[PDB]
Amino acid sequence: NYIVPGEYRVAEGEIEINAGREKTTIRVSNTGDRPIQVGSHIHFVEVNKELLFDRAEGIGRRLNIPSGTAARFEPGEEMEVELTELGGNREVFGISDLTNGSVDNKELILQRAKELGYKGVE
Amino acid sequence: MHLNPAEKEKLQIFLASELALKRKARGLKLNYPEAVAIITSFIMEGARDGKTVAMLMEEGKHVLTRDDVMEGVPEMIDDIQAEATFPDGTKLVTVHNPIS
Amino acid sequence: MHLNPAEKEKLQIFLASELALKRKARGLKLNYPEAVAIITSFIMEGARDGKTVAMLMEEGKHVLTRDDVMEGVPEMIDDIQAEATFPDGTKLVTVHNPIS
Amino acid sequence: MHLNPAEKEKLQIFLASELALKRKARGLKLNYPEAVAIITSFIMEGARDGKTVAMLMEEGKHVLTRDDVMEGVPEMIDDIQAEATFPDGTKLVTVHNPIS
Amino acid sequence: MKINRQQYAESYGPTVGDQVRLADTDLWIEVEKDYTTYGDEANFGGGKVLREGMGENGTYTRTENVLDLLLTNALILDYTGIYKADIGVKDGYIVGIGKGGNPDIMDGVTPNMIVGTATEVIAAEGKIVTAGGIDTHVHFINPDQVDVALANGITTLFGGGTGPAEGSKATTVTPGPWNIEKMLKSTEGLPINVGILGKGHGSSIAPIMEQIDAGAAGLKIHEDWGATPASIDRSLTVADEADVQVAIHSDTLNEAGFLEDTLRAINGRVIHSFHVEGAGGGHAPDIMAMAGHPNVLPSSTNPTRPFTVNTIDEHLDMLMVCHHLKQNIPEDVAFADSRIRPETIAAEDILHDLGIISMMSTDALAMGRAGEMVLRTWQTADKMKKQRGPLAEEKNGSDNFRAKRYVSKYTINPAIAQGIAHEVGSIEEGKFADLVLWEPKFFGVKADRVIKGGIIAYAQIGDPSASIPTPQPVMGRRMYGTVGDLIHDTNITFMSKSSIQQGVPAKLGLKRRIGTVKNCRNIGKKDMKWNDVTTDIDINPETYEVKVDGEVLTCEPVKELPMAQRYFLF
Amino acid sequence: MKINRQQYAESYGPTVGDQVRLADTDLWIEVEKDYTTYGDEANFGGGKVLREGMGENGTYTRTENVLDLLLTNALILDYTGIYKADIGVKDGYIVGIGKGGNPDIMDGVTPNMIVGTATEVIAAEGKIVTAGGIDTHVHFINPDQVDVALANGITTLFGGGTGPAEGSKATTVTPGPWNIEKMLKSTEGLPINVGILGKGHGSSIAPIMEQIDAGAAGLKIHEDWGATPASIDRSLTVADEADVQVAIHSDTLNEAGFLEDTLRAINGRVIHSFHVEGAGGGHAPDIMAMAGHPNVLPSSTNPTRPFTVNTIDEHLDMLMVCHHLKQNIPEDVAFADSRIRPETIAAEDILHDLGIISMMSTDALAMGRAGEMVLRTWQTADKMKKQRGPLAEEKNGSDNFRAKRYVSKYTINPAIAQGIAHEVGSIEEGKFADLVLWEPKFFGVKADRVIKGGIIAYAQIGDPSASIPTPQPVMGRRMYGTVGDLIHDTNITFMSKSSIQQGVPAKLGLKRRIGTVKNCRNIGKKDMKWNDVTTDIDINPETYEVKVDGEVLTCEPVKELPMAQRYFLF
Ligand code: NI
Ligand code: NI
Ligand code: NI
Ligand code: NI
Ligand SMILES: [O-]
Ligand SMILES: [O-]
């Protein structure tokens, strides 16, 4: 019965994020000499050119991490990350200008990624 | 004196600290604004004394203890922040969890 | 601290009371605003101490006597009123004819 | 209390003087606003005590000396001026070169 | 991937089933539902979700379903529910309650809650958000009273006065066309919503009605102007024609009638009964029986709220001093003893708990505290839980039913009573964006940020010279919504339909938003949200004992309250 | 008759070859030239020169070459020179710099600087006069910040915000047409010049451009809204069409790119790089390399200025607390260590000294001090003189070259960067009369008098109840230029050409003077006065070592500064 003013009494259980969406694990390498941190809601194919991964596996996806958090890659660091699917209309505009429409246009996204030197387009 | 706006406001903190120290001296457990005032004034006077930001980050955790304050006050105060003129100009001091 | 408007104003009363108490300590007969400040601050500190409204209505008549103040000051002060936070919330104290 | 605008402002000077006196008591050399505050409050309290303007013009030159204040502070303070209520009403006191 | 509930609540605020303590009370609110999609919560900052091409849409212009302001992750406490949502504001109004962000990539986005280029963000994660308080018993005596009210989460002041004139110091009255015009002009500089009451006194219609046509929003009947059967009758005839509310402070002295005479003059017409317990005024000793009637919208003022060990000593002395009464004149002592009654003050706590008194109010600077309407509402609910237990209607060990009953008393019910609930009084789509953010540790004590018409008007914030806004001293300060011409767009002057039709705003050069008072004459007790109980209240004329359904209503005074000495410097 | 130089300087202020110490620094300024005629100096008072038929002309009407205001015997410190002159003001503008008085009887009177019946006098003998400071990194968070800025000689605030909303607490952004309109109305009550930045974020032009048409004066790109290649590109396309400036806080996280990616998106277009050292934000660790490029107008914010023994401890903790980072999460510690770097803060002191960083700014209330832009400029120049010696360019043992290099950083260079230097930023004929008088003992610490549009807006002045204005307490106070409608004529709202053409001022009822933003897209580093150096800045990604011309730029932190504990009560 000690009172902490405004304290929470949270319920039992756990919160599952991005429930029901496909998950994908991929290896990602920071080939640059400066650190790269990637937020939860950036279209994963549009991250920093010097991140090396299978760019096709970033299309229509983002990191499967709590909303508002980020994954960090130190210079030269390679690690696995888990991606989830974008929702809503599954459209991306702006950011790196690789998509500007449906994420279903994989051919077009990868052509633009390759032309601009985003590492890991097969 | 050439008081600027901050100098005028910060006189209030010193005053509230003096009030709170009188209340503590006559045996009262201090409340939330009292505790904040005492620790804040301590930081500003420490800067004036020429202590470092690092010294005040340490000392500010030992100004008041749990038995100086009312139930719940330690858990109400996550941080106390003050800016004061150090020998090397204005700096920000944050005292985290000042009262355990 | 989260000071509200009244908390900021009432710091002034404490300050004026400290000034007046220093003047009384060096032997001065106190004037109208000095006397009001001392009795007002006494009431507010008494609430903070957890006294009742009834205790402060009594005590406030014995803080200053006629020989503490200038000629005419007792007859200038019909009432002193203060609101302060008691353990049971804000209450109004009126001290009638505080100085006989 | 019936505070007028000047009475409210001049409470600040007393407060700044109390702050400065605490700093001097723990061994600090005082700065420009501290020194001004101490001498100003001294003048206003002297009026309240019933001293003459001439007495305060003299005394105000002996409140702080060069070794009480930081390098350059004596040469920064050409004059300190205060108005206060003397027994014969408000008068202006100017203390020239208060700190030689 | 799963997040434990403690970490989830720390990051995004609480979700469904989680409870939050209100300040240092023993009241707990429980999240009833949550509009989010777990994993697509909105948030703002470095590497956070509300960024261009991500949770912020980079395509849509402002007109295209984009918000001016998103409050993220709010715990809403309102008569409509206690629940978790994003709140979207546009053109100064609440336009969406639901889930904000970017339909490009997020599931579950409410279609008109797009975060776009045009959108400002307020983080409400870990905050309680309420409607601004509606104070309907304000004496305009000292303009310094406005910040006092804003600091405790009040956003609307309804009442009267011209400053510290005796008529205004006693009564919520701005009398006659000229004083009303002058105070409508004064209101252009007050950073709060305002409605002005005229004098509800006269035996001819025209002297009363001309106040409504001049721009009054309602009338006040007060015994100090003669709360006679004639003044009551003419005021209610005017109100029924003009569609404005009438507040009454009845004839304490019983000079021209007893309570039954005042009710006969009212003749079943709608009326707001001020300080219905009666310490603040009314037929001695039985005025509080008004609160049983279906045509009465009953409010308390705050100094009797709740019943404490200092209340009677404080009130008996206050009444004697105010009225210049003498302790050695037996008629004076008899009057005071007839008006300040522990029996009716104790019963008033319980009548609030039972939903028989529908509203709180201040009586600011006449016999009440401008900054304590919200404070004392929650102190009353806390005392009633301690003394009467959880209400029968509760479930899950939460105090949600009590919390909705009590929040209604100072938000929606005063707005309904005044005919202004189309604009203010609740967090609902289509209403003005008057919103108060509270840290739960300060809930009902000191507001964090007060939003007026979608712009922050008042905030607890620190040193303006600092690198960041949190260093000391943290104190209540007016924000940009109060500065320059923005004070016009962020605040409403409430006026009668007739004054609006007759062009009073243009005549006086009023630049504030103009609110219409309407739908005040059709309503009754049944329209008071969570506080709709009608019953026969018996007040024993010998003992002052209050009975409802044959049971004496009594409770003890408390020696201590929450929301008191832990928080206040004085 | 001859006057010795000590007595001459005591009576009229210094003349040619005389030096003045800036506050308690070891910086000396030397009078380069003097416009007076010895013996015909202007002065005002009993038996003084500016009297009818003498130094005051009694013939000419105001239109006939007569001034509204003469500042007598000013020591001007400006990018244009350090020199002695009278300053004449008319219609709120500087109309003459030269010699004022009466051509009837005085030699050398500048023909449009007649002292006549219409002329007010300010005695500037023994004062230093500068242009008002131009702060281009202001967060509008707390209106109390305006007096803070005026007290340290700032007269123009460029930035954004809606008050203490999280978007505004992080970013200099007033987002979208509605928030921009609201804050233009708020600005009617702020006694300082203002320009508002919109959100520099979007992937379509129209959502960004509508902010410029609504009345924004520029844009801010900030990482917290997504400092992506798309947002950068669209913002600069808008800016090039609209002729407004873009400020950038780049992608610290390197999420969508490294510095070279941001420069590629900029594509040689003009941009203002905020807090270019990077503690205040930007590509970790090498953002400060921006300051070498010809299309970059680089500014510092003030908390890193200059490098002191408390700087790193203060900044590392501030960053952790602000960003809610945990000392026990290695990613959080790595991020903080990547952003707060003694190597780049020490190099930033030297880059200022070399004229490679062109501007100072505050970052008021987001990560910077509203009242310390001028203060810390001079503390930096003093530290650099102590550590690096007099610059090669100096002569006569004066610090004039350094003094012109540093005064330019907070006066003319921000005004040029923003497209407002036709109105403000220097003491030149034809510019708005925003002037700051300083006692040399308080120079850069506390302004004596701040003139806004030719009327004093702010002054260090004493007891308002006293016989004379000098008795205690002497404190910063708003003067008549801030009162009533005079606040409209003494201050400028800077707006885009398109908002002005579209009649936004009339639509919103703005009464302030309206300033046009223009000539922002044609300029580069070469246009920064005394601070025009382009060079290849190398930042070692492993050690954070900064190199220019193959030399490591490093200096020690200092334990003490001038303009600090001698002056401040806290
Ligand atoms: Ni009443
Ligand atoms: Ni009343
Ligand atoms: Ni920044
Ligand atoms: Ni900033
Ligand atoms: O009342
Ligand atoms: O910033």
Swiss-Prot record, chain A:
GO terms for biological process: urea catabolic process. HAMAP family: Urease_beta. Disulfide bonds: none annotated. This is Urease subunit beta. Heterotrimer of UreA (gamma), UreB (beta) and UreC (alpha) subunits. Three heterotrimers associate to form the active enzyme. Keywords: Cytoplasm, Hydrolase. The keyword Transit peptide does not apply. Belongs to the urease beta subunit family. It holds the Pfam family Urease_beta. One of its GO terms (molecular function) is urease activity. Coiled coil: none annotated. Transmembrane segments: none annotated. It comes from the Bacteria. One of its GO terms (cellular component) is urease complex. Pathway: Nitrogen metabolism; urea degradation; CO(2) and NH(3) from urea (urease route): step 1/1.
From Swiss-Prot, chains E, F:
Ni(2+) 2 binds at K220, H249, H275. It holds the Pfam family Amidohydro_1. Heterotrimer of UreA (gamma), UreB (beta) and UreC (alpha) subunits. Three heterotrimers associate to form the active enzyme. Belongs to the metallo-dependent hydrolases superfamily. Urease alpha subunit family. PROSITE patterns: UREASE_1, UREASE_2, UREASE_3. The gene is ureC. One of its GO terms (biological process) is urea catabolic process. Its cofactor is Ni cation. Carboxylation allows a single lysine to coordinate two nickel ions. One of its GO terms (molecular function) is urease activity. It is found in: Cytoplasm. Its EC number is 3.5.1.5. The active site is at H323. This is Urease subunit alpha. It catalyses: urea + 2 H2O + H(+) = hydrogencarbonate + 2 NH4(+). It comes from the Bacteria. The modification N6-carboxylysine is found at K220. Ni(2+) 1 binds at H137, H139, K220, D363. Residues 132-570 form the Urease domain. It is an enzyme of class 3 (hydrolase).
